[PDB]
Design a protein around this nucleic acid. Structure first.
Lengths: 27, 218, 82, 56, 129, 180, 141
RNA sequence: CUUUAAAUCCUUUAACGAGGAUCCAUUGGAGGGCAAGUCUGGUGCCAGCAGCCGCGGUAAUUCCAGCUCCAAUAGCGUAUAUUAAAGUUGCUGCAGUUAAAAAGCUCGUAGUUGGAUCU
């Protein structure tokens, strides 16, 4: 599991990088 | 190891129920994902369709939960779709995989024209609805592929459908409603009465009736 | 459910409601399969045979399961007349 | 507003010359190289996210 | 007022079939309704029906085998040529394996497959599957 | 007025979605497996198969005894068999819909030159054809996309004038032999 | 509901004709006021003389001085505000010189921050701005 | 040589012609949509980017550059018109309670549509 991307998402659900992390988790 | 907590789980674990289709025949709820692991665990593939951050306004800030949409299914006529909301993303994905396994439905496949070989497309035009999202599946000729948006395409490929035409109305940007409408349309394939299904239903003994002795003696 | 050669290609063959001839879906958890014991004509005892009636959840929801099962039993001779 | 700052950042950045590197292949050879990279030999595939331009 | 008594008949059959009822009362009856019902019955979609003879206009009691997914009318009765029949039956029918388009034809009221067999067009009355 | 003809036609179609990972991977796999120059070759073969499928579909909507259906389906099936894409056993229009793009890609001159042992790889096959080393029957063929017919398959040889197939060593070998 | 009659073709056609005028895109295309009001007069590009250089303040969420030029089109004499896209590219334009201007990309609509600007400078002194920016060409003296 | 009035071009010989085969492939991009780097340096709500949402106020994955990557490729970007996407003109096939919307209400001509029935 990519815990890196999920943890960065939980750091900022609406952050500047939130869309990129959400797209990364999808798949 | 797996210790079942229901009669259906025990019957499946004890090699008394031959296939998942014997459970589907009696419309029995499946409450243990280990049954699905027992029957299709060697071919199930899951994809995360979306992680969606939902927020509840609280007195101090916004509470944030993550909603995972997971489509599962072997590419041979079974598919499920599960949605799980959790504090953490990994927990949401695990729970959504479990819920997708629990919601796996049989998929009926038909022929567009002539019936050479194995079925490739939906048996007829079917429609699924979910919150203003309407998804229509139309039988397509051999080799057409799936003419659909990416989300219904994922669900339909995971359902073993080879060729399909798709029409979508409503707010398909709502990925959850899109996925649920596609799942509903795919589910309606086996509930649609066609003339080949007019032959009188010959009832067989239920799993809870056929193996009652095993349940009592256990 | 058949192909050109003649082999059956469906994954399974779903049951139909005994009251409406509609297909009972694989997720119709309100649907039932009542088993009605059959009785020896002379002794009045359970002879091991039974009549099976599958009723979809739609009929049970509208309250018609009672009358539907009564009609099915009457047609089978389990329920007498008047 | 004032138009005085026009080529401000572009003029004030340190000019760094492009490094000399060997030419890349073109046409069928470039696509062959891409195909080999993506499909033929791939070791780090163990269920984790790897991008073609990952800096980590 | 009431135009297209066939539309009323088909909609009543549709609603009765959706409600799960075993019999539907159709009034008024007409020749076109009877021929449409005969077309539907020859394919096993409705089963036997009876014409109650009033002295004004017919009534019909149609027994309902629970096979009819949908019976509908097309209004207006568009004139249909043989080359244009595939488009109609691709728009109206759920599959190429089942379902019929009813046409009134100089050779009678009949489904699209038999219209093809007789090599003839007509006016679309309705459909059922 | 001119004595010229302006009948010209585009041989491919660009995909609707430019950046789709699954399609990019499939096309790159085809390119690498068959030694294609670019994505336009994949799109050209895809367009050919698409037109064939459209014709077969339109024929399958006609009556089975339609004179036009019989004539044009027979012609289309004969054409598909002639290039080896279809087998002679499957002479029904329903088997056209079961054809793949790789079926047509096998019948290129490049694929056949590689598969007949005349080249060590598909890229060697392409550069051999482009360098006038390959002939079909007695015609020196120079086009990698030359679709080999069924009866032209056994006549792909190595050219009577190429250094590999009949003599006259090339520029490099002659220069080196002159040097020493 | 809508009319479904074998002889309603006139009513259907007339209703569609009338209700097409309630479509913004159709009415703009087929009314003629937009073409009269369009500074380019339906053209994709136009030439003008740079009247002056102006700085437009970006809209409120953003803070910048977008470097535009007031130009006057040769074909009709209208005064246009045209954005100069890249940075330092305003140094290439000099007042009272020829400039080729295109639309800004939204078919007569302001783009992004720059308010009321729907044109961008494409060429100056008959050499493209992209060639000047990359140093491929220089201003003709 | 051939071609052609005559030529050119293509084809055909022959001679020379490749190892940074320097006989050098570009045009756009790398936050999302949408394939591809929260790598390094600079700038610091400036300059600029950005079709849209947005990025930039000292760790900028978005600007200016270097490296790397990826999209198409002898082609690629931009503007504009147009078609599909648009079931956002709806005949197929849209809407009208509250999102835009049923005339204040009736009559009423043209228009449109009109019940069963005749081997």
């Amino acid at each position: 599991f990519p815990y890196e991307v999920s943890d960065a998402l939980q750091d900022d659900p609406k952050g500047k990088y939130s869309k990129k992390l959400l797209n990364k988790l999808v798949g | 190891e797996w210790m079942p907590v229901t009669k259906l789980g025990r019957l499946v674990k004890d090699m008394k129920i031959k296939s998942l289709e014997e459970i589907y025949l009696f419309s029995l709820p499946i409450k243990e994902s280990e049954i699905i692991d027992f029957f299709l665990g060697a071919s199930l593939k899951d994809e995360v369709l979306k992680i969606m951050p939902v927020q509840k306004q609280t007195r101090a800030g916004q509470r944030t939960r993550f909603k995972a949409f997971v489509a599962i299914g072997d590419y041979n006529g079974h598919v499920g779709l599960g949605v799980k909301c959790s504090k953490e993303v990994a927990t949401a994905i695990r729970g959504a995989i479990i819920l997708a396994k629990l919601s796996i439905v049989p998929v009926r496949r038909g022929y567009w024209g002539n019936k050479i070989g194995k079925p490739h497309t939906v048996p007829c035009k079917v429609t699924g609805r979910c919150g203003s999202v309407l998804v229509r599946l139309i039988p397509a000729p051999r080799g057409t592929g799936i003419v659909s948006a990416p989300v219904p395409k994922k669900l339909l490929m995971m359902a073993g459908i080879d060729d399909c035409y798709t029409s979508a109305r409503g707010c398909t940007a709502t990925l959850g409603n899109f996925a649920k409408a596609t799942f509903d349309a795919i589910s309606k394939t086996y509930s649609y009465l066609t003339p080949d299904l007019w032959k009188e239903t010959v009832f067989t003994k239920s799993p809870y009736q056929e193996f009652t002795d095993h349940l009592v003696k256990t | 459910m058949q192909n050109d050669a003649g082999e059956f290609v469906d994954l399974y063959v779903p049951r139909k409601c005994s009251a409406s001839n509609r297909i009972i879906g694989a997720k119709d958890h309100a649907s039932i399969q009542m088993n009605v014991a059959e009785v020896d004509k002379v002794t009045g005892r359970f002879n091991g045979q039974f009549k099976t009636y599958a009723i979809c959840g739609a009929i049970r929801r509208m309250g018609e399961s009672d009358d539907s099962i009564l009609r099915l039993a009457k047609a089978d001779g389990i329920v007498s007349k008047n | 507003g004032s138009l005085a700052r026009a080529g401000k950042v572009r003029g004030q950045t340190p000019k760094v010359a492009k490094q000399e590197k060997k030419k890349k292949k073109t046409g069928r050879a470039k696509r062959r190289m891409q195909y080999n990279r993506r499909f033929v030999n791939v070791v780090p595939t163990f269920g984790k996210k790897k991008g073609p331009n990952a800096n980590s | 007022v009431r135009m297209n008594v066939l539309a009323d008949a088909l909609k009543s059959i549709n609603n009765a079939e959706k409600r799960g009822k075993r019999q539907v009362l159709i009034r008024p009856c007409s020749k076109v309704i009877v021929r449409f019902l005969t077309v539907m019955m020859k394919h096993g979609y409705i089963g036997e029906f009876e014409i109650i003879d009033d002295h004004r206009a017919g009534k019909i009691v149609v027994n309902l085998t629970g096979r009819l997914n949908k019976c509908g009318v097309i209004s207006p009765r568009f004139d249909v040529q043989l080359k244009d029949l595939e488009k109609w039956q691709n728009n109206l029918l759920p599959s190429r394996q089942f379902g019929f388009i009813v046409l009134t034809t100089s050779a009678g009221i009949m489904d699209h497959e038999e219209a093809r067999r007789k090599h003839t067009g007509g006016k679309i009355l309705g459909f059922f599957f | 007025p001119v004595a010229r003809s302006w009948v010209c036609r585009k041989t491919y179609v660009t995909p609707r979605r430019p950046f789709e990972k699954s399609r990019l991977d499939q096309e790159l796999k085809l390119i690498g497996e068959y030694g294609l120059r670019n994505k336009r070759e994949v799109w050209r073969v895809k367009f050919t198969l698409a037109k064939i499928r459209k014709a077969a579909r339109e024929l399958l909507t006609l009556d089975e005894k339609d004179p036009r259906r019989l004539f044009e389906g027979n012609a289309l099936l004969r054409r598909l068999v002639r290039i080896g894409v279809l087998d002679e056993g499957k002479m029904k229009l329903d088997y056209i819909l079961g054809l793949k793009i790789e079926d047509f890609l096998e019948r290129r001159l490049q694929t056949q030159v590689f598969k007949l042992g005349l080249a060590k790889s598909i890229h060697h096959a392409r550069v051999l054809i482009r360098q006038r080393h390959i002939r079909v029957r007695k015609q020196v063929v120079n086009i990698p996309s030359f679709i080999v017919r069924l009866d032209s398959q056994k006549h792909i040889d190595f050219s009577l004038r190429s250094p590999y197939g009949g003599g006259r060593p090339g520029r490099v070998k002659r220069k080196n032999a002159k040097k020493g | 509901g809508k009319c479904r009659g074998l002889r309603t073709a006139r009513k259907l056609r007339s209703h569609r004709r009338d209700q097409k005028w309630h479509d913004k895109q159709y009415k703009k295309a087929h009314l003629g006021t937009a073409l009269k009001a369009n500074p380019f007069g339906g053209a994709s590009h136009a030439k003008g003389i740079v009247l002056e250089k102006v700085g437009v303040e970006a809209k409120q969420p953003n803070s910048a001085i977008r470097k535009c030029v007031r130009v006057q089109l040769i074909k009709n004499g209208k005064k246009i505000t045209a954005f100069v896209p890249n940075d330092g590219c305003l140094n290439f334009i000099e007042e009272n010189d020829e400039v080729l201007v295109a639309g800004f990309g939204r078919k007569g609509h302001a783009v992004g921050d720059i308010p009321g600007v729907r044109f961008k400078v494409v060429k100056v002194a008959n050499v493209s701005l992209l060639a000047l920016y990359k140093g491929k060409k220089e201003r003709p003296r």
